[PDB]
Amino acid sequence: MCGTEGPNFYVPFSNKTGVVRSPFEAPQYYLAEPWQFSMLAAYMFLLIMLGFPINFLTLYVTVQHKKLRTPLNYILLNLAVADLFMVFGDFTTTLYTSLHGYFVFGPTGCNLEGFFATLGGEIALWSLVVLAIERYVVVCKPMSNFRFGENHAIMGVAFTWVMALACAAPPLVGWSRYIPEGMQCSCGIDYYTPHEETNNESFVIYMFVVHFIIPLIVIFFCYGQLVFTVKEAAAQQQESATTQKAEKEVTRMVIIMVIAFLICWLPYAGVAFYIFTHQGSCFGPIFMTIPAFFAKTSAVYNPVIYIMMNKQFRNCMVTTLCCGKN
Amino acid sequence: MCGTEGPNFYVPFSNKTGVVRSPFEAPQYYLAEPWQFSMLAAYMFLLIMLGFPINFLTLYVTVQHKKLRTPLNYILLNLAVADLFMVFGDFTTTLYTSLHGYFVFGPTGCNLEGFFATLGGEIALWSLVVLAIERYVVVCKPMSNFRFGENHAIMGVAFTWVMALACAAPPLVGWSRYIPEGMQCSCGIDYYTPHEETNNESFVIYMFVVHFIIPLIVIFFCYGQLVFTVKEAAAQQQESATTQKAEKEVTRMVIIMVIAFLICWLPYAGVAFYIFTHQGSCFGPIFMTIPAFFAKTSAVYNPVIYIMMNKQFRNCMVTTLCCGKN
Ligand SMILES: *[C@@H]1O[C@H](CO)[C@@H](O[C@@H]2O[C@H](CO)[C@@H](O[C@@H]3O[C@H](CO)[C@@H](O)[C@H](O[C@H]4O[C@H](CO)[C@@H](O)[C@H](O)[C@@H]4O)[C@@H]3O)[C@H](O)[C@H]2NC(C)=O)[C@H](O)[C@H]1NC(C)=O
Ligand SMILES: *[C@@H]1O[C@H](CO)[C@@H](O[C@@H]2O[C@H](CO)[C@@H](O[C@@H]3O[C@H](CO)[C@@H](O)[C@H](O[C@H]4O[C@H](CO)[C@@H](O)[C@H](O)[C@@H]4O)[C@@H]3O)[C@H](O)[C@H]2NC(C)=O)[C@H](O)[C@H]1NC(C)=O
Ligand SMILES: CCCCCCCCO[C@@H]1O[C@H](CO)[C@@H](O)[C@H](O)[C@H]1O
Ligand SMILES: CCCCCCCCO[C@@H]1O[C@H](CO)[C@@H](O)[C@H](O)[C@H]1O
Ligand SMILES: *C(=O)CCCCCCCCCCCCCCC
Ligand SMILES: *C(=O)CCCCCCCCCCCCCCC
């Protein structure tokens, strides 16, 4: 028996020595050295310092450039706000609590911080999904005589909110639950503990399917079709060298988008799966931190991929940074 | 009497309570809370995470692009290596010692770490100086029938090394000295203490003049003349719109370069001056950290200004990041 448990938590450490305390009450420095708690904080510092400017800039530059506000960009803006929730509801809090060596906000603080930290990265997730669907619709033109417009773009955004609530809201009401995780400075969904009172098991499956498999499939299909439609067109168009460039560009970019999605969600998926099927086994606090390290950083690399590498967004950004010129 | 002193150090705190320990021996958590030591470490993390890629990339991209290696770029490469010394000899060490709450490497560790941390930012300093001189020489053509070439560029680089040793080497031999500074996790020149055995006073003046005033003057003169020569040419050339752009660009860039130089060196200068003329007065550990916060970060913003905003370097960089294309 690998850890110690209580009404609202599970500490990944054995109380055989009597040292273990509530992660809501005293420091966890038996889980990890304090410098490791600092490093956790250092990381949380990095992600704020990078995540905030680049995501906030996105909103800001949109306000400055009329060229940018187009129904197809609505979802990208959604991404940037979602990333901000991640930045404030998650990274900063965790910067704060890590520096105490435990989650100082108690169980309600855990529900809140967990809800927003989940709501943030889930909106971001479904945004990447919705974007792919639209680009598929717009570029592949699967349904004839359909022009994508502002009203569709709204639903696409609202869809992310519904889907993200369909994930983050249930633990607040008793399907799974939020508990401190890893080094116990941050709160997340309990996918690793078979807590029957909240039916944690049925939820992790529902998560694995609806919030992982569905996204992975949609994202592959949609972009799959795209790299098809575009490679097709170029082969029928070879007298055009620009067109040849375009097909090249798009492919590369989709490879990046697809790889990026995996780097973000694979570890959380691989780990959740492994634990589910390895149930008798002991999983340390740091290791539990790893798939989180991966997903959290997406709040930096997503807008670099999806915004900064965008021709339109970058120029407006470069213009604004340089105070109106260039 | 504001602090406590010992053979190799000065702690900015009063031993009237008997709590003060050697910064080479035990934690300084009476100087500042531990979370503040973490934050110091977080900052040191930021500067490595940003400072290393962008400075190392510079060296690397030069290796990949023949277009870049030109005598006028030698000094820029010097800048990037100097910034690296700052990154490894300073930021990482300080990341390490901060996490102990004192300088764990003892006085010899203090001499080393101080020497390299000084040598780094001083090479960087004189690089910005040398660059300005060359650009003045090349653009203003003050001396007729002179073409700048590889051999001049070498001396320019070597000059930075001589000048930086003319600064960093004396404290190792008894003109001033290296002691832990601020929160006592890092070592620097002792400009704040009137330690007569090493003649700290005559050195801070020599520093203030030779390593601050001289740089400030040269940098203003040289770039002053440049924004003159270029504004002159455009006024005589107005039928050319490109030329009009150029004069605009250069001016803006010099404003940035000049402002940047001040942001880096003004606080260290203002503080050193104030302390010199305010000698009876007490200066806290954190405040002593401030002008260092400013100068250290230049290891990030200098190569952004001087390298990434360079048309030539950026493109090669953008090419290399994207794995040969675009
Ligand atoms: C991990 O292990 C440690 C050790 O098992 C455990 O800490 C212990 O918790 C109990 C509470 O359940 C503490 O017991 C108290 O001890 C003090 C005496 O110093 C008293 O204040 C308390 O007495 C009251 O309660 C007793 C019965 O529960 C009655 O006998 C008495 O009349 C009072 O009503 C009580 O004995 C105990 O001190 C700690 N021990 C240590 C070493 O901290 C901890 O709870 C575990 N962690 C987790 C995560 O569950
Ligand atoms: C800031 O203040 C504190 C308090 O003033 C100061 O720490 C003290 O340093 C002295 C050493 O100079 C320590 O004295 C030792 O105490 C222990 C007893 O616990 C003994 O090991 C030592 O005895 C030897 O030395 C004595 C004379 O120096 C002889 O009488 C004896 O025979 C032995 O030779 C010695 O007394 C003292 O314990 C600490 N006190 C505290 C509270 O830590 C500290 O040095 C100051 N910091 C700085 C930066 O200078
Ligand atoms: C940058 C934001 C910094 C926020 C405050 C960090 C405060 C850490 O606070 C410290 O936590 C310790 C337990 O670990 C307590 O014992 C100390 O009394 C408490 O001061
Ligand atoms: C990322 C690099 C982390 C390097 C190691 C940091 C080690 C901090 O180490 C700790 O310092 C304490 C005093 O402050 C000592 O009391 C502890 O015993 C020691 O483990
Ligand atoms: C060849 O095609 C290599 C191409 C792709 C490079 C894509 C880089 C995206 C980087 C996003 C930001 C990542 C780091 C975030 C750190 C917190
Ligand atoms: C109008 O001209 C505003 C123009 C200048 C912006 C120049 C920005 C340079 C930034 C360099 C890197 C700074 C941050 C380093 C953080 C560690």
DSSP-derived secondary structure for B217-265: HHHHHHHHHHHHHHHHHHHH-TT-HHHHHHHHHHHHHHHHHHHHHHHHH
Q: Which CATH class is domain A1-326?
A: mainly alpha
Residue from B296, B295, B238, B307 nearest B269 by CA: B295
Domain boundaries, chain A: 1-326
Integer Cα distance of B98 and B184 in angstroms: 8
Contact present, B34 and A29 (Cβ < 8 Å): no
Q: What is the DSSP letter of B126?
A: H
In whole angstroms, how far apart are CA A94 and each of A53, A91, A216? 19, 5, 29
SS (H, E, C) chain B: CCCEECCCCEECCCHHHCCCCCCCCCCCCCCCCHHHHHHHHHHHHHHHHHHHHHHHHHHHHHHHCHHHCCHHHHHHHHHHHHHHHHHHHHHHHHHHHHCCCCCCCHHHHHHHHHHHHHHHHHHHHHHHHHHHHHHHHHHHCCCCCCCCCHHHHHHHHHHHHHHHHHHHHHHHHCCCCEEEECCCCEEEECCCCCCCCCCHHHHHHHHHHHHHHHHHHHHHHHHHHHHHHHHHHHHHCCCCHHHHHHHHHHHHHHHHHHHHHHHHHHHHHHHHHHHHHCCCCCCCHHHHHHHHHHHHHHHHHHHHHHHHCCHHHHHHHHHHHCCCCC
In the block, tokens 């960093």 appear at B168
Q: Method used for this model? A: X-ray
- A106-135 helix and A71-85 helix, angle to the nearest 10 degrees: 160
In the block, tokens 């950290």 appear at B289
Q: Which amino acid is located at A7 in the chain?
A: P
Integer Cα distance of B181 and B28 in angstroms: 12
Integer Cα distance of B76 and B74 in angstroms: 5
In whole angstroms, how far apart are CA B133 and each of A34, B144, B151, B161, B214? 49, 16, 15, 16, 12
Token output for A263: 């780097």
Integer Cα distance of A208 and A196 in angstroms: 18
CA dihedral A73, A76, A80, A81 (to 10 degrees): 70
DSSP tally for chain A: helices H, then strands E: 10, 4
In the block, tokens 């930096």 appear at A300
Which residues of B contribute to the annotated binding site for Zn(2+)?
Answer: 201, 279
The 3-state DSSP class for residue B192 equals coil
Q: Please tell me if residue A141 touches chain B, with a CB cutoff of 8 Å.
A: no
Resolution value, angstrom units:
3.3
Distance from CA of B174 to the nearest CA of A (A): 36
Nearest CA to ligand 5 atom 14: A301
Token output for B123: 């090479």
In the block, tokens 């991929």 appear at A305
Q: Please tell me if residue B35 touches chain A, with a CB cutoff of 8 Å.
A: yes
* Helix, strand, coil percent content, chain A, rounded in steps of 5: 70, 5, 25
In the block, tokens 């110091």 appear at B40
In whole angstroms, how far apart are CA B170 and each of B114, B202, B203? 12, 12, 9
Helix (H) or strand (E) holding A120: helix A106-135
Contact present, B41 and B49 (Cβ < 8 Å): no
Contact present, A122 and A163 (Cβ < 8 Å): yes
Integer Cα distance of B234 and B231 in angstroms: 5
Question: Ligand 3: which of A100, A102, A184 to mutate, most ligand atoms within 8 Å of CB?
Answer: A100
Token output for B315: 């493109």
Residue from A255, A265, A305, A258 nearest A79 by CA: A305
Integer Cα distance of A153 and A147 in angstroms: 11
* Chain A residues near residue B46 by CB distance under 8 angstroms: 42, 45-46, 49
Q: For A62, left (φ over 0), alpha (ψ -120 to 50), or beta?
A: alpha
Integer Cα distance of B263 and A70 in angstroms: 40
The 3-state DSSP class for residue A33 equals coil
Residue from A203, A112, A191, A217 nearest A166 by CA: A203
Residue A212: other Cβ atoms inside 10 A: 17
In the block, tokens 């003159």 appear at B228
Residue of B nearest to A39 (CA): B42
The 3-state DSSP class for residue B8 equals coil
Integer Cα distance of A289 and A181 in angstroms: 8
Integer Cα distance of B70 and B93 in angstroms: 34
Specify the length of chain A in residues.
326
In the block, tokens 């994207």 appear at B322
Give B186's strand partners.
B181
